[PDB]
Structure formats: C-alpha cells, structure tokens
Amino acid sequence: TTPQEDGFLRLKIASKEKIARDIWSFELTDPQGAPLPPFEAGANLTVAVPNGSRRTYSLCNDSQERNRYVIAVKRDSNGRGGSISFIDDTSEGDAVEVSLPRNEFPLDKRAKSFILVAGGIGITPMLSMARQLRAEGLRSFRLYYLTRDPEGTAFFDELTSDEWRSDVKIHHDHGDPTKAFDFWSVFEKSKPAQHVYCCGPQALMDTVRDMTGHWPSGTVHFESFGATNTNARENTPFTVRLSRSGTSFEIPANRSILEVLRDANVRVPSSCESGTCGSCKTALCSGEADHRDMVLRDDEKGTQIMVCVSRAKSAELVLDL
Numbered sequence: 623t624t625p626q627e628d629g630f631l632r633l634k635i636a637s638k639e640k641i642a643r644d645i646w647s648f649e650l651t652d653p654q655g656a657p658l659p660p661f662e663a664g665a666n667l668t669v670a671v672p673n674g675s676r677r678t679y680s681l682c683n684d685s686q687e688r689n690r691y692v693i694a695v696k697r698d699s700n701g702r703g704g705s706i707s708f709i710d711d712t713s714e715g716d717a718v719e720v721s722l723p724r725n726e727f728p729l730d731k732r733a734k735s736f737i738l739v740a741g742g743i744g745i746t747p748m749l750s751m752a753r754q755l756r757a758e759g760l761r762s763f764r765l766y767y768l769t770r771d772p773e774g775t776a777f778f779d780e781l782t783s784d785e786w787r788s789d790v791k792i793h794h795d796h797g798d799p800t801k802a803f804d805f806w807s808v809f810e811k812s813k814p815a816q817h818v819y820c821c822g823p824q825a826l827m828d829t830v831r832d833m834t835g836h837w838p839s840g841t842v843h844f845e846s847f848g849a850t851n852t853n854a855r856e857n858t859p860f861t862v863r864l865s866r867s868g869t870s871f872e873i874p875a876n877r878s879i880l881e882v883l884r885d886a887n888v889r890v891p892s893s894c895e896s897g898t899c900g901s902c903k904t905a906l907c908s909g910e911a912d913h914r915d916m917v918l919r920d921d922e923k924g925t926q927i928m929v930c931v932s933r934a935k936s937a938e939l940v941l942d943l
C-alpha cells in the first residue's frame with residue numbers, strides 16, 4: 623500500500639533549514655498553493671521519508687495558518703534510519719507525501735491557564751500550543767523548556783526574544799544530570815482549572831508525573847515520542863508466518879514487520895510508527911518477540927506484538943493475521 627493509496631497528500635518542501643545542532647526545520651506547502659487541511663495545536667502528521675519509512679512529526683506553526691505545515695526533525699544517528707533519511711536525502715523543492723493531520727494532543731477547552739513543559743525536541747507540540755494560546759489571546763501560559771545548551775536548543779533565538787521571554791523559561795543542564803531544574807516550586811500549588819502538558823524524554827515525564835501526584839485528576843497530560851531507541855548491537859533478519867493468511871515473509875535487518883506487511887498489502891492499522899499509539903497491536907501465536915514498544919505491559923508481552931517497532935528473539939514468529 624503506497625502513501626497515495628493510503629490517502630497521503632503530495633506536498634512540496636518549500637524550505638529546509640538547520641535550526642540547532644542536529645535539528646532541521648521543514649516548511650511544507652501544497653505545490654499549487656492550495657490551502658491545506660486544518661489542524662489545531664498538538665496535532666501530528668505522518669511523512670513518507672525518502673527510504674520508504676513513515677515517520678510522525680508534530681506541527682509547530684500557528685494553527686490559524688492555512689498555507690503551510692512546519693515540522694522540526696532531530697537527526698537520530700542511533701535511530702532506525704528514518705530521521706537520517708529525511709534529513710540527509712531531501713532537498714528544498716522536493717515532493718514529499720504527508721498524511722492528514724491527526725488531532726491527538728489538544729489543548730483543553732475549559733482550562734483557564736497552562737503550564738507547558740518541553741524537553742529537547744519535545745518542544746514541537748508545546749510550541750504549537752504556545753502559538754495558539756497567543757493567537758487566541760485569552761488564557762495565560764508558562765513554558766518551561768529544558769535542553770542541554772543553547773546550540774542544541776531549537777527555536778532558541780525566537781523564544782529568547784522580547785516577544786517571548788516573559789512566558790518561557792529555558793534551563794540548560796549542560797550534560798550534567800546533577801544540574802537539575804526545580805520542578806517542585808513549579809508544581810507545589812495547583813491553581814484551579816490549571817492544566818499541565820508535558821512532552822520530553824521519559825525521565826522528564828516521570829519527574830513531572832511524580833511532582834503532580836497531588837494535582838486534580840485529569841489536569842496533567844503527556845505525549846511520548848517513543849521508546850529510547852533500543853537497537854541492541856545489531857538488528858537481525860527473522861521470518862514471520864501469518865496464521866490465517868497462510869503466507870510467510872522474511873523481515874530483513876533494516877525493515878520493520880509493518881513495512882514488510884504493508885508491501886504485501888496486509889492491512890494493519892498504524893499511525894505513530896513509534897510504538898506509542900497502540901494501533902498496530904497484533905496477536906503473536908508463537909515465538910519470542912523482542913518488544914521495543916511503550917503500550918504493552920509485561921502481562922501481554924507473550925501473546926501480543928506492536929509490529930511497527932518490535933522484532934524477534936526467536937528465529938520465527940507466527941502472527942494471527
């Protein structure tokens with residue numbers, strides 16, 4: 623199933639700039655200048671990258687714009703190849719196929735104020751929320767932004783400008799785990815109808831979760847960008863047998879099960895491709911899966927598999943497809 627058969631739109635890379643160490647910004651427009659599908663803050667879309675992989679990125683431009691989508695992609699040298707492919711093998715002017723935006727992490731309508739916490743490239747959904755709150759002009763926010771140093775901080779100059787410096791607080795730990803930010807002062811008292819949104823490394827999100835254990839239920843919201851890339855020394859090929867379809871596929875070292883099945887036109891629901899959304903859950907009839915996801919707790923880890931990220935510890939898996 624190609625991106626086009628899957629409903630992707632053909633956009634054009636209007637602008638590609640390096641904006642921090644290892645982080646690039648892309649501006650995507652319709653090639654004939656047509657208005658794009660609407661989105662709101664927190665929305666994600668999937669991009670077909672030049673190597674054939676599909677990767678999900680947050681929209682970080684003002685949601686009142688109809689003419690472009692802006693994403694910021696960190697190049698992951700230890701990743702699966704997708705961000706490397708999108709950063710290295712694209713040029714300005716290239717066509718790129720892109721899904722409709724998915725409204726997956728929205729600002730609460732009834733909240734009156736916001737604490738936004740971004741770690742690293744987790745800036746992108748928090749920025750879109752900050753932009754939208756500004757454009758709306760009604761509710762106040764504070765953005766806490768935690769990165770390593772100014773050079774590796776996306777949107778540093780904009781968010782340190784006069785326009786923003788009152789509402790965003792940037793902390794650099796300079797690579798010392800011990801240079802920690804005081805979150806307890808931030809979360810000590812809960813204001814009424816004050817919500818917290820957090821996007822960052824799992825360790826940052828855990829901390830914000832532990833500091834807000836006393837906040838009212840349903841006022842603290844998290845979005846994960848996916849597991850801490852566990853590419854353990856190598857990736858090895860294995861075989862996948864399908865139980866109902868009666869077919870078999872070899873999964874090579876550099877492709878996911880999902881990518882191989884999708885080429886065979888086996889229709890498995892997928893959105894995130896990062897093992898966080900839970901859609902691609904598949905029954906495992908036999909075999910030791912090597913789980914690399916975030917949605918399966920120990921208690922289904924012997925009978926289910928997120929085909930978008932996980933591989934095999936046995937030489938063969940048998941999936942109920």
Ligand SMILES: Cc1cc2nc3c(=O)[nH]c(=O)nc-3n(C[C@H](O)[C@H](O)[C@H](O)COP(=O)(O)O)c2cc1C
Pocket residue numbers: 666677678679680681693694695696697698700701702703704705706743746747845846847848851894895896898
């Ligand atoms: C909801 C969601 C949003 C994401 N947003 C971004 C983003 O804005 N920028 C980014 O660099 N990675 C983002 N990611 C991670 C990418 O989808 C991808 O996993 C990452 O670029 C690593 O891929 P690679 O292993 O192929 O290098 C997001 C993941 C999810 C699940």
Ligand code: FES
Pocket residue numbers: 891892893894895896897898899900901902903928929930931
């Ligand atoms: S597609 Fe989201 S977890 Fe696999």
